[PDB]
Amino acid sequence: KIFKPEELRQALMPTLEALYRQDPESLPFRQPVDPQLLGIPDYFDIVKNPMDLSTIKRKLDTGQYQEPWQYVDDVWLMFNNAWLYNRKTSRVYKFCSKLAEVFEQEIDPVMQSLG
């Protein structure tokens, strides 16, 4: 199963768009966490591989995902980073959980169609 870059992008983009359409829940995830601006030097000590929606979109737009599971991995990386670093009742954690709910709903039929 070799994937054409534009077809992989076309099949996956709606799942990413669904995340972006979540307002306010996507908002903390539409751009990278910047620990220097936020003044949180511990962030990169906990989150070794940062990920966010803007980076996932750029990768999806620029043929950086050869296979669908690589995209799925990055989305889960984004979620797991947020759930690891932040308090359970924090806004970011709660918002993350909503995006995860949406993603789990969107991704299943898409991954089945691709496979």
Ligand SMILES: CC(=O)Nc1ccc(O)cc1
């Ligand atoms: C997605 C995320 O982890 N955002 C975030 C983390 C720490 C902070 O102090 C402010 C925002």
